[PDB]
Amino acid sequence: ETLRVDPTNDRLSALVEIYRMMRPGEPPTREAAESLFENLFFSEDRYDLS
Amino acid sequence: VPLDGGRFATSDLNDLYRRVINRNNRLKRLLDLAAPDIIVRNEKRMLQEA
Amino acid sequence: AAAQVLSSVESEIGRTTDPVRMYMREMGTVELLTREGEIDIAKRIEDGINQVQCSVAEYPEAITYLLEQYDRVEAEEARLSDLITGFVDPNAENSIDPELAREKFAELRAQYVVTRDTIKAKGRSHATAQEEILKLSEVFKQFRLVPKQFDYLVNSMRVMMDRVRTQERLIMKLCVEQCKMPKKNFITLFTGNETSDTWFNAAIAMNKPWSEKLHDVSEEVHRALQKLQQIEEETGLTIEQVKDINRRMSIGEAKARRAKKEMVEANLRLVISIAKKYTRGLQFLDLIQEGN
């Protein structure tokens, strides 16, 4: 059902949607989307579970 | 009003008035400078927000 | 086409209320120019500036104003006022010295005294008179004045054109909107002589029953004629010449403004990159405007 509701189709579309949700108004970019997604949970400086 | 220790205290209304009249004077200066329309639009939006 | 994605983003925003990111989105449309954009833009700015300088040189009393304040301060045995900085200061391709000012004004006096009689010979359109006027404008062009005095120098043309154009549209403000004479013949008759009433009573010669009842409004339609005659006699220039001068000043200034405007947004990114370091004393977006 979740795939049914999903409008996206590939990784680029998903990253663009994540960027649009996190930073509305700012146009998405090929590299900015992946940089933000990496910095969300996959950067030591900006994430830590201890 | 002055404070006992040589300090001062004021309401935030002084801050808000300073901000709005600073931006209003900057807009007045920009209008006679024939500035590019995007900067004048940004200043008008800043005045609206202030 | 950087504006194509603008439709796809703005129509699908989350309705951001942050003025900073919307401003940066607005300024992100223009791209960065390097090693070619700056040179071409500077060339266009210089072309506009030289067109403006050309426009003021044709106006006969511009030389008289360049000269008369210096004549006035000559009698004071010195020029200690700040207008000595606003001297001609000829460009080369420092304090104002008399050895330069007097040498520059000698040929100015010579042209001022030699360009009067040639105009009267074979009319204003005399080939030698026109070339002598062009030479005098050229020897005026070899000066580099200050923008302070230059501002009122061009403001004089702005105000003179405003006055002459108000006197012009006064004709339609008094008679065209009420009496309704056709503009097809009016535009041709106005350019005919614009010195006398040859077309004014030529219209009376035709049938023109609307024009037949002009005596009641003669003492208010001829006042504009007298005012434009006064403008011509005080400025010493025909209507067509000043129209051409200002119609080319207009597009020269428009070109300069377009060049400067187009150059400006190419460095708004630099403005932001500098302003970010100075926050937080005051604000973040006001610093951007001050950088602009």
Side-chain angles (χ1 to χ4, degrees), chain C residues 67 69-78 101-102 105:
Chain C
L67 175 54
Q69 62 264 332
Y70 206 99
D71 279 312
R72 175 194 68 245
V73 308
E74 270 170 351
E76 296 152 19
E77 212 72 27
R102 312 328 312 131
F105 281 1

Side-chain angles (χ1 to χ4, degrees), chain C residues 1-78 80-86 88-205 207-279 281-292:
Chain C
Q4 282 192 355
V5 285
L6 194 138
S7 174
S8 71
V9 61
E10 168 51 47
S11 173
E12 279 84 0
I13 54 168
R15 307 227 147 252
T16 179
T17 46
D18 187 23
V20 200
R21 66 178 69 183
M22 62 195 336
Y23 165 67
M24 305 182 29
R25 158 187 81 210
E26 287 171 350
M27 61 75 88
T29 75
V30 298
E31 48 267 45
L32 284 86
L33 46 83
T34 167
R35 285 263 81 84
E36 308 316 323
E38 309 162 359
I39 310 298
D40 179 69
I41 291 170
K43 295 305 213 29
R44 296 148 65 188
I45 291 176
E46 295 338 284
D47 288 7
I49 287 303
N50 303 7
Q51 266 156 9
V52 173
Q53 292 184 358
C54 271
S55 313
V56 302
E58 307 193 5
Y59 154 68
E61 280 97 1
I63 321 162
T64 69
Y65 186 123
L66 170 75
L67 175 54
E68 100 294 9
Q69 62 264 332
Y70 206 99
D71 279 312
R72 175 194 68 245
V73 308
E74 270 170 351
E76 296 152 19
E77 212 72 27
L80 212 43
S81 47
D82 210 274
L83 64 97
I84 191 170
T85 69
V88 316
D89 201 357
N91 40 342
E93 59 97 20
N94 299 116
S95 176
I96 291 301
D97 313 331
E99 46 95 10
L100 297 179
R102 312 328 312 131
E103 191 268 331
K104 288 295 155 143
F105 281 1
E107 52 253 14
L108 286 193
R109 308 300 306 122
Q111 287 308 121
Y112 163 101
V113 85
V114 84
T115 47
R116 21 166 65 101
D117 50 347
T118 183
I119 288 295
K120 308 179 192 297
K122 207 69 177 176
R124 175 78 180 183
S125 84
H126 202 176
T128 183
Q130 287 312 308
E131 78 95 18
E132 210 157 3
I133 287 291
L134 286 185
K135 188 254 168 183
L136 158 61
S137 151
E138 192 264 1
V139 63
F140 173 74
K141 279 155 179 230
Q142 71 191 18
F143 309 143
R144 197 262 304 149
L145 278 57
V146 303
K148 338 322 161 283
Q149 287 192 13
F150 208 30
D151 284 335
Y152 165 49
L153 202 43
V154 298
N155 277 323
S156 302
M157 271 327 117
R158 307 231 178 258
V159 299
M160 291 315 298
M161 261 285 168
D162 285 323
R163 150 178 128 164
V164 77
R165 76 170 55 257
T166 48
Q167 293 299 323
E168 204 277 341
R169 328 187 297 295
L170 202 137
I171 307 167
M172 297 42 65
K173 295 283 172 305
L174 78 98
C175 209
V176 169
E177 304 300 324
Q178 200 269 300
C179 208
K180 185 38 216 176
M181 71 275 288
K183 299 293 293 198
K184 314 304 286 173
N185 54 292
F186 175 79
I187 59 179
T188 71
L189 290 167
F190 183 77
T191 63
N193 65 356
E194 68 261 9
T195 48
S196 178
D197 310 340
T198 61
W199 40 278
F200 254 81
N201 54 21
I204 319 298
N207 41 5
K208 305 189 173 289
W210 35 273
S211 196
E212 289 278 351
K213 298 313 282 305
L214 274 206
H215 289 309
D216 54 350
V217 295
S218 276
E219 209 54 37
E220 61 104 8
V221 73
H222 305 329
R223 320 311 320 128
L225 274 171
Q226 300 310 112
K227 288 292 109 181
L228 75 89
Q229 293 314 120
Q230 183 257 340
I231 294 170
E232 292 159 340
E233 79 178 1
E234 66 95 31
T235 322
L237 204 77
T238 76
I239 298 318
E240 296 309 314
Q241 295 155 324
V242 72
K243 304 165 57 38
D244 176 71
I245 286 166
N246 287 265
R247 78 139 263 285
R248 71 178 177 86
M249 215 169 61
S250 307
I251 50 56
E253 194 67 19
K255 183 65 205 73
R257 283 276 280 99
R258 156 68 42 77
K260 266 156 170 164
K261 156 183 168 293
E262 151 186 10
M263 149 85 79
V264 159
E265 324 77 339
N267 303 294
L268 263 50
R269 277 150 174 133
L270 202 161
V271 170
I272 299 194
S273 297
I274 275 177
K276 51 146 160 212
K277 308 175 140 23
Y278 289 98
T279 191
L282 164 153
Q283 208 65 53
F284 175 69
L285 216 178
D286 287 280
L287 303 176
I288 289 177
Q289 292 300 92
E290 300 294 327
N292 292 131

Side-chain angles (χ1 to χ4, degrees), chain B residues 18-40:
Chain B
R18 283 192 306 110
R19 184 187 320 286
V20 301
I21 78 168
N22 274 315
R23 287 170 170 162
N24 175 70
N25 302 326
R26 194 186 294 115
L27 182 59
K28 289 201 280 151
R29 179 191 331 159
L30 273 172
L31 269 282
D32 68 89
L33 255 295
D37 289 307
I38 78 164
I39 298 153
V40 184

